[PDB]
From a paper:
Cilium assembly and maintenance require multi-subunit intraflagellar transport (IFT) protein complexes: IFT-A and IFT-B, which form repetitive structures known as the IFT trains. Powered by kinesins and dynein 2, IFT trains shuttle cargos along axonemal microtubules to maintain the steady-state ciliary length. IFT-A is also essential for transporting key membrane or membrane-associated proteins, such as GPCRs, ion channels and lipidated proteins, into cilia. For biochemical and structural characterization, we co-expressed and purified the human IFT-A complex, which contains six polypeptides: IFT144 (WDR19), IFT140, IFT139 (TTC21B/THM1), IFT122, IFT121 (WDR35) and IFT43, with IFT144–IFT140–IFT122 and IFT139–IFT121–IFT43 forming the “core” and “peripheral” subcomplexes, respectively.
Purified IFT-A complex showed biochemical homogeneity on the SDS-PAGE and gel filtration chromatography. Single-particle cryo-EM analysis was performed to obtain a final density map composed of volumes with overall resolutions ranging from 3.0 Å to 3.9 Å. The IFT-A complex has a dimension of ~380 Å × 150 Å × 140 Å and adopts a “lariat” shape. Our cryo-EM maps allow modeling of almost full-length IFT121, IFT122, IFT139 and IFT144. For IFT43, we resolved residues 121–192. IFT139, made of TPR or TPR-like repeats, forms a right-handed superhelix and is distally localized in the IFT-A complex. The IFT-A structure revealed five unexpected zinc-binding sites (ZBSs): two in IFT144, two in IFT122 and one in IFT121, containing strong Zn2+ densities. The ZBDs found at IFT43–IFT121, IFT122–IFT140 and IFT121–IFT144 interfaces could be critical in mediating inter-subunit interactions and thus essential for IFT-A assembly and stability. Interactions between the “core” and “peripheral” subcomplexes are mediated by IFT122–IFT139, IFT121–IFT144 and IFT121–IFT122 interfaces with estimated buried surface areas of 596.4 Å2, 1220.5 Å2 and 3191.6 Å2, respectively. Notably, IFT139 dips its last two helices into the first WD40 domain of IFT122. Part of the IFT121–IFT43 complex inserts into the superhelix groove of IFT139 and uncovers direct interaction between the HA–HB helices of IFT43 and IFT139.
Residue numbers in the entry:
A (entry chain A): 1 to 44, 59 to 276, 283 to 393, 408 to 457, 471 to 490, 492 to 577, 584 to 945
B (entry chain B): 1 to 198, 219 to 227, 246 to 745
C (entry chain C): 1221 to 1342
Write the structure that this text describes.
Amino acid sequence: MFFYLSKKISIPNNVKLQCVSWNKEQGFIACGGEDGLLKVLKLESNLSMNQTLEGHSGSVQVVTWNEQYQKLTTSDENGLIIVWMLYKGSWIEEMINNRNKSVVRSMSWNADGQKICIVYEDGAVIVGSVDGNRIWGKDLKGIQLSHVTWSADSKVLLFGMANGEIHIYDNQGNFMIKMKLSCLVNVTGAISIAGIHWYHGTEGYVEPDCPCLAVCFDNGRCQIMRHENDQNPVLIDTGMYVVGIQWNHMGSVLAVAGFQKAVNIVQFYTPFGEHLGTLKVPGKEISALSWEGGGLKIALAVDSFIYFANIRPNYKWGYCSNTVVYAYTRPDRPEYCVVFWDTKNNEKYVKYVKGLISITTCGDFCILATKADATFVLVLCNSIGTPLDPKYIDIVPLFVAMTKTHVIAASKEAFYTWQYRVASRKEGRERIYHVDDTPSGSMGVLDYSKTIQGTRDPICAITASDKILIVGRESGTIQRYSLPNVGLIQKYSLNCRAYQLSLNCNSSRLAIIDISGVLTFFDLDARVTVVGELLKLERRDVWDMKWAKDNPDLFAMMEKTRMYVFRNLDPEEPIQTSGYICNFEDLEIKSVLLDEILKDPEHPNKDYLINFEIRSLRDSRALIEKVGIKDASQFIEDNPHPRLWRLLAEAALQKLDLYTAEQAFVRCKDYQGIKFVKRLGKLLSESMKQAEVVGYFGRFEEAERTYLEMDRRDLAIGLRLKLGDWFRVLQLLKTGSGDADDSLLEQANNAIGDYFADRQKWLNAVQYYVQGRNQERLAECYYMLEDYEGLENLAISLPENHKLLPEIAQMFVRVGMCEQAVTAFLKCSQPKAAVDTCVHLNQWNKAVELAKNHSMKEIGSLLARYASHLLEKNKTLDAIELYRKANYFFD
Amino acid sequence: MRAVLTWRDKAEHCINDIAFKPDGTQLILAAGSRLLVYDTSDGTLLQPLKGHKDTVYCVAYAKDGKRFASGSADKSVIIWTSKLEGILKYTHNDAIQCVSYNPITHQLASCSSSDFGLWSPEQKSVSKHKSSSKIICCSWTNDGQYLALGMFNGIISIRNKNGEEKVKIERPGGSLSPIWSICWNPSSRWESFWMNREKSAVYSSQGNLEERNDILAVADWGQKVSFYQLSGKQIGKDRALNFDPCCISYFTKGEYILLGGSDKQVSLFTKDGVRLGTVGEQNSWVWTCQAKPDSNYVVVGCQDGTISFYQLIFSTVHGLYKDRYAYRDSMTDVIVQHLITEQKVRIKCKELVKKIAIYRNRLAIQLPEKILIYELYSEDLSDMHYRVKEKIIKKFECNLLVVCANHIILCQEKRLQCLSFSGVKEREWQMESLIRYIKVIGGPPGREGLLVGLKNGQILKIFVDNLFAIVLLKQATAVRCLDMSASRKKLAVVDENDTCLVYDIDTKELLFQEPNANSVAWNTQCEDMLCFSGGGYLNIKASTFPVHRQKLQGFVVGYNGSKIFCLHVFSISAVEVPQSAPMYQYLDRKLFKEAYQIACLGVTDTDWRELAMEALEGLDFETAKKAFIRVQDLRYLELISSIEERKKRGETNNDLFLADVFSYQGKFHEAAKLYKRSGHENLALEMYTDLCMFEYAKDFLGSGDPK
Amino acid sequence: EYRSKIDAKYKKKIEGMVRRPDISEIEEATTPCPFCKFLLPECELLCPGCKNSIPYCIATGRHMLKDDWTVCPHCDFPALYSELKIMLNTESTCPMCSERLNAAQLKKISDCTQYLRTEEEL
Ligand SMILES: [Zn+2]
Ligand SMILES: [Zn+2]
């Protein structure tokens, strides 16, 4: 959550602006003038600079967009309401109305745009449909109005009096209770509202019952209340004559525009009342706010200027393995939707999470800090979303710092350390420390009495490398503990309050981005006579940073709209980009455009992943381009690094030098490359080597096409067979001829059957295993599919003896088909089991018949004692039934 | 349905009316001349309020938890406040029959035998309006805009806040059917209006409707309950009763109705008026049948003076078959939810669904008087168009219900009875002690298998097409939550000690025990996987390995592929099984084929690579090839192909292959040791000269100097 | 599909071999590839070393060898000199071209680079 002024639009003739309304769906900005001026603008510098001067003498006061149906509405100081529609790329007046009694104090469209309420000063209220008077125009009472607002369901319609009273209404002139104002208790003078905004949940709510409606008064005190509350987030501001209120598009930030006595200010708050910053706009006086559609830009009216401020929100994102994790709220479901977009395979993995305090990543893992119904949860997840381990902890996971093999969840007064891995699975050693505890070298286990003591210097940020833990506190003091066994090593007492901290791989220095965005560097181990020292690299508008996983000196940062890379305090040329550094490694920066993704969270394009190469790699690549491999090789040898060596080797392989490539592979100590080059040199044909090298880089389709073009279906088939593309093998085997195509196609069909069966996709593997000739797996597919007719057909199609027939007969016995099981066993030539199943399944007729045939004669005693047991149970009828079945008719 | 009596306490006079504090902390009665204040949690009488001089007839809070009124036979109304002190008072010309508070504006409305009076909190006098006859009921609308007065003439006068009669609803019969109770449906947006709350001075007296969707429940003394709209039109037909009603009310969200009166009992009804069951059976007329503001608790005060506090408990009625899960919604509907596509389907039964059984293309619903049999007809895996196949009209008594293709199974005591879909009875099996569990285990359409467990501890398998039970096991303690492995080769039992015992069904031998199980589910797709929940913790076993337990709210209903399905308070939920833990457990035991079988259920790519490399080091080239294919590493795939062809041509040394694998990962030292052990130091020398590690090549110059 | 079609004289033999399986099979000898000297099975024609198809001896069907090379003077097809010489003892015509071919017409070729030239680079 950072913010900085970015642009300015000077309205001609220096007329004062009294209202700015940024259309949310379309990037239209409507500006009201002090001398009848009304302008419609659009960015990308303006595109649709328009002067909708039709009518509107005097001044222009209220301006409201209709969003859906895209209808602007505007009013004068003379009561002339005008509704404008976009026709032929220009704004023409569509409707004109004029009530000749007073001045329109406010106007507001419904949550669906079908209904509009307009409130005058004399108390008259006119509610219209999109075309005419919808229901009523009420004259109310002896009251002077200033505001109007609908509810989410458009049922209540709460006004605002001139004297400072909000009145809750019915969607008609039916007066329900007056609102109970809890924010103002000690005020004494007259109070005016000057700002009311109800976040009609249209992008979801940050919390399932978060405060939505927001009321402020010109004195400076605000209340962020849900529906008609009685207890509610109260806020005090030093905003003299607060000028406006504007919720975010997601209702997660509230912007309060005013000016202190002291000078213009646009403060920002969370829905729960947490402060976030201050903008300090120039000019004489602010007049209105308006967020963009995406909440990234805010336009605010100061005198004859529309100042634009760029906003960096607090996205819940992370990068684990090749997966970008990003979370967002949506209107339909009441819980966060977290997409584990795996960039390697362009796959998505949508999870739904209730609390989701934070998302943190490190290595191929991701900690989701959430709030449960053991009150808070830290879900340790894979890179594809599967929760490996939900760990329930009690302290609030306000700040989560995740190192490989450690997770530190810190509230404002304590931190909890949990080892979730070993350099390789859970070896949980959970500990909790109060900030003022000064733990010794090692130790109490899971003692939770330390999280209730309370502190006067709360935690503001935390970070942890593989060796140390740095807790930043609200006074600027940072505390350094030894991570594997938490023990207070040092306190440093920096200058400014920390917002973000990062440690290089050496854990020798710490980058600190304060609350105001200023980036500084601290050197922990650099002892001056003191313990640590600053480094004199203060930057101004930094909002993101990342050290190398390889080089302690290498650093990357984002300032406003440019990325800088530092090699020990020496910046390079900026790169125009607006992205978040996913990874900094091997002279390469992988970043993603979250601003673009979160506008279409369902379909993240691969075009939003951008890779940059730092000066060394770009220089080496360009020098390889300009001069031949021979000289760039010498240059790279002068400045050696494994990434450059691999680049040189791959360039040589592309050129098929096979000598510079081998040397550069030796430099990388890459035995795979050395062996591949030796095998390639043993090969004795060009366009054979070219196919080999285009297979080396993973262009499998290119290699296959290359093999086909040189009239080698054999090697294309071999390449597809080394891989698992068996469908490709079937497609290729359809055309031409081969040395052994029946066996190859049978192998392909069996392999596809296995491919479908390993994924529990029978009735697809059953399609194969039949064109191919597989029996053992086909019986399993029939069994799991419960296609017992297919099992019977398979068993009668097998030869007289087989290793599979007994298994089929066992399957039949389990399911209960006595006849098919008996036939299968007799095919196996196992009459003993064929009669044991008849006994087991109580088919005594068949048992006695098979005993007579195959000469066992041991079933007479079986029947005798079975009937004896039945008689012992007084079930004489059952005994008669068996004796009839077994043809023992005499008994 | 089941109601448990939390506490019962008897007063010395008939209980006329009751009221709940909106927080639910305490309740207030009207017994004789005093107002008894009880604590809802326990029933301990706090204070008898002693303001009135005659019998108290009515009481009601202000929906704000700050005041409550009470009118009495002394022709007076006293407004008390919280902390139980009388602060305001006024009088009528007759005994006050009932008093109510406006849900929004706190405008008190107190009726009497001749007139009704309205009083706003800020008003300085009571506005009295005459009435046609004796009023007995008051009911403010949810938005607080209209007031319904039921009268002894069998007439409801619906009036505005001023007192003008907006509409008049005339119950058939006139004075034949006095209107003794009314209640507005409390289900609206205004229900949440007051969920975020935070010297007796006598008061003087001063003498569209079409688009609105409001329902007034009316309890007449012609023994009927009607539902009227605000426009006077009736909703549906009447519901004939055989008792005089004296109290009609609603739950918190207006989903169920409470009805008491001349019958010495209290009954729960659907919001449409279909009877669901009995709440309590009393010894006198129930004069009031209110319900706790935000819970299932109900309180019943009768003429005997008895006050009873029941907690209503609703039983989960559901069935699940593989990827389909049917449950009971709103006590009269059946919701069939697909566990893959999540395409829910609702089936309206208009009657209290007692039991549900589901099966492939079959859905049995036991209504109180009949069983409905539903079928699927389209041959689509995601088909969700259930049509009625049969209606077995018979008052059925059964402990359990099961449904099979072309059959229905009823468990009743020791009788396991098998009926056709037309109601014909085909077979019957007599059991040993008592049938505790039953479950279809698949089979041919008309020849399916059933898995039965008994309180005897004996576990049997019964085939629908034959008259004999096959004995599977004779356990020691009772049986509960039987389940069978996907291959029908393993059984899993819970035996009243939460001890999940797993048996090998063919050798009668048990494989392992677990000490905490309330529900067991075998993986329908992976045979080795097992799941069991008990004690608030999930558990996932892979073969005879340790468990990977989570925390859980609910009990396990199913386990399909890689998803657990658990039920928590009628809400289904899916838990994503971590396949990596069983994968690594199989890997550490050097079991590569089984590790691959577990991995195929879904893991990341790093786990796939780890399994591939561990297979390579373990010299299982088939599983290594398959895992590498799922990672598509042409380098390692070509290495494995080269090793396979070298093995094919005759090379049968298992240390050369491991040396090559080590050299190819990058060990360069263990590979050299393996090369030397396998009798090839020349290959180690070649590796070290190729890597230009000539200081190590001096070590493997074993041959000497023959060039 | 092929059942009930084996010759009645041989159904007994086929069922006898299947009923008592005999996995005993003598391994086929390996011979060098003519291009890269890679040892591959005699009847395998695609060399896994150079990925090149190997010409087949028109006398045995085995892949060609450098040290036993020859060609019929008529059809110019490759053949194994020893194998073609032995087979010509009982056949008076070339197996491939069906032309009159005697033993004397075979000349052992020492330089077979003409037939081992890849078509792409030639
Ligand atoms: Zn070769
Ligand atoms: Zn010839």
